[PDB]
Structures are given as structure tokens and as C-alpha cells.
Design a protein around this ligand. Structure first.
Ligand SMILES: CN(C)CCn1nc(-c2ccccn2)cc1NC(=O)c1nc(C2CC2)ccc1Nc1cncnc1
Ligand SMILES: [Mg+2]
Ligand SMILES: [Zn+2]
Length: 313
């Protein structure tokens, strides 16, 4: 109760900023997460014994893949922390509880392959979950870990608060399926423009929480150029492995996944920032003005990829 987590001064200051990188020391990431839960939620939200045990089980169930790994989980949770801390009064006690945990759990047991590769491989998960294959799996894994003895961090909630938080987490994790993002942002665009957006409407909050989840999930494009550039290598390491596996199934992969087409990456990053990232953080800033720094950083990095094409780097 009277035990705080404290960070070194540089982290204590830099963790509050959207562009914070969690660093290369794996053994500090759990404490970083707890630090963020205590400041975002309270010293009281979770039994520390239970939280710590949950955190290490979740870690254990992320795999040693180049991008969709434990560092990604904590990175995405930190971006949610920054959004929540810059939008204090907009979010309920349960939502701050649910969303940090949703972010930490959102890619549990990711194998480094897209839902498309699972479908074409005919993976058993593709027969169990026809759409949002991995995302339904990640939520399923979150519930399994919560039901490990001594792991139920939500035990102190009423029955109804419990059903609400697991519902917040389920919707939150499903929303990380980028195939659902396009329609979600367009609906939020019309609502904001026509003025029908209403955060007291639960179906509306759901959509807004989903956009936050896309924003946190894509947040590697909102870091300083050197972080963003070096994370790009990790995402492409998976994409190329997935392309290799498509060739093994006798299917020419899209250029994004073809390691024989590295030359097309700068242009592919332009398409990605223009088609996906810039619209995401634009709509998010319109709805949640204090999240503007993510849009600004995303723009700085689009400009960095333009310079790569032009030959200036
Ligand atoms: C959203 N995509 C699935 C389709 C669009 N697209 N097209 C190309 C492309 C097209 C043609 C040629 C080369 N590339 C590449 C992308 N996507 C990403 O780059 C990307 N995707 C994701 C989503 C989880 C999957 C996350 C991060 C990404 N980037 C990144 C950059 N910096 C740091 N961290 C991450
Ligand atoms: Mg995912
Ligand atoms: Zn993710």
C-alpha cells in the first residue's frame, strides 16, 4: 500500500511523454508497467502480489518474435498510459484499470504471422475464429491467465464491475485488428463532423476506445526517428518471414512481405502513414485534443521517410 515504484529521474520525466522509449533493459519493463498502473489508476487498483504474478505470466506467454513481443506489449501499454494521463477526467475508474491491462495483453502468444497467413496455412485457430483470428486468441489467453490461481487482479471488483472490465478488455483487444480500424475511424469521422459524437453513448465510447487501441498499437510510428526506423526493421523481419512461409505454401506474397522487394519499403511506409497512421492520429486528436503530440511525431516520421526516398538519407 505505502510501497511506491519510483524510476530514475530521466525515466520519471520522459515516461510522461508520448514519444518515450521503454529502453533495452527487459528487467525494468514490469516495474515501468506497475509505475504506470500506480500513477494512472492508484496504489490501490490491484493487489501488488497479484499484479506482479499476472505481469510475469503475461510476459511468459509472449514469444521471442522480432516485433510482436513483450517489449511491444509494454510499449503499447505506455502509449495508453500517456493518452489516459493527458485526458484525466474523460475516463472512468474501470476504463483506466481495463485499458492498461488490455494493452499489456493485446498480442498474447502472437506467432509473428498475420490473420491472412493463419487462414491460408489453415491453422486450427482460423477454424475456431473465422475473423479477428489472433485477436480472439489474445483475449482468450488473457482470460486463461486471469483464471490461473493467485492471478485474478480484478477479484476485489463487484460481479458487475468484473463483467464490465472483461467486456472493456475484449472490445479493446478485438479493436487491435487493423481490418476493423478503417470502418471504425470513418464512423468516428462522420460522428465528430456531423456533431453526433457523444461520450455518454456507450457504443460511442467503445468506438473511441477502439481508436485509442489502434493509436497505441501503431505508436512505434510516433517515436523519435531513430526508434521508429529501428522498430521498422523488426516489423519487416516478421513480414519477410511471413512472405517466406507464403512462398513455401506456393503463394507469391504481397510486396510488403517479399524480402526480394526491400527497395519498395520507403514507398510502402508512405502508403502506410498516409492510408493508416496519419488518419488514425488525426481523428484521435480531433476527439482527444491533448493526443496531438502523436499526430505531430507521426508527421515528423512521414517527413523522414519522404527524405529517405529523395536520397537525403
Ligand atoms: C498495416 N499493414 C498491415 C499494411 C500497410 N503497410 N504497407 C507496407 C508496405 C507495402 C509495400 C511495400 C512495403 N511495405 C507496410 C505496411 N505496414 C507497416 O509498415 C506496419 N504495419 C503494422 C501493422 C500491425 C501490422 C504496424 C507497424 C508498421 N510499420 C512500422 C513502422 N515503424 C515502426 N513500427 C512499425
Ligand atoms: Mg495484434
Ligand atoms: Zn500489437
Amino acid at each position: 500500500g505505502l510501497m511506491q515504484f519510483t524510476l530514475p529521474v530521466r525515466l520519471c520525466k520522459e515516461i510522461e511523454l508520448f514519444h518515450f522509449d521503454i529502453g533495452p533493459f527487459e528487467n525494468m519493463w514490469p516495474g515501468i508497467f506497475v509505475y504506470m498502473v500506480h500513477r494512472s489508476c492508484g496504489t490501490s487498483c490491484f493487489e501488488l502480489e497479484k499484479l506482479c504474478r499476472f505481469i510475469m505470466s503475461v510476459k511468459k506467454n509472449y514469444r521471442r518474435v522480432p516485433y510482436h513481443n513483450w517489449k511491444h506489449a509494454v510499449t503499447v501499454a505506455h502509449c495508453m498510459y500517456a493518452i489516459l494521463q493527458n485526458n484525466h477526467t474523460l475516463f472512468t475508474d474501470l476504463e483506466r484499470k481495463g485499458l492498461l491491462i488490455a494493452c499489456l495483453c493485446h498480442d498474447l502468444d502472437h506467432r509473428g504471422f498475420s490473420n491472412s497467413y493463419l487462414q491460408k496455412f489453415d491453422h486450427p485457430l482460423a477454424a475456431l475464429y473465422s475473423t479477428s483470428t489472433m485477436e480472439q486468441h489474445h483475449f482468450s489467453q488473457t482470460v486463461s491467465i486471469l483464471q490461473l490461481e493467485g492471478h485474478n487482479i480484478f477479484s476485489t471488483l463487484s460481479s458487475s464491475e468484473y463483467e464490465q472490465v472483461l467486456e472493456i478488455i475484449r472490445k479493446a483487444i478485438i479493436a487491435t485488428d487493423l481490418a476493423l480500424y478503417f470502418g471504425n475511424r470513418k464512423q468516428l469521422e462522420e460522428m465528430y463532423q456531423t456533431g453526433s459524437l457523444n461520450l455518454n453513448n456507450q457504443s460511442h465510447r467503445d468506438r473511441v476506445i477502439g481508436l485509442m487501441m489502434t493509436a497505441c498499437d501503431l505508436c512505434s510510428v510516433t517515436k523519435l526517428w531513430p526508434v521508429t526506423k529501428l522498430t521498422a526493421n523488426d516489423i519487416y523481419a516478421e513480414f519477410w518471414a511471413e512472405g517466406d512461409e507464403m512462398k513455401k505454401l506456393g503463394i507469391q506474397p504481397i510486396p510488403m512481405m517479399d524480402r526480394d522487394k526491400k527497395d519498395e519499403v520507403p514507398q510502402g511506409q508512405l502508403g502506410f502513414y498516409n492510408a493508416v497512421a496519419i488518419p488514425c492520429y488525426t481523428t484521435l486528436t480531433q476527439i482527444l485534443p491533448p493526443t496531438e503530440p502523436l499526430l505531430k511525431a507521426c508527421r515528423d516520421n512521414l517527413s523522414q521517410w519522404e527524405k529517405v526516398i529523395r536520397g537525403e538519407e
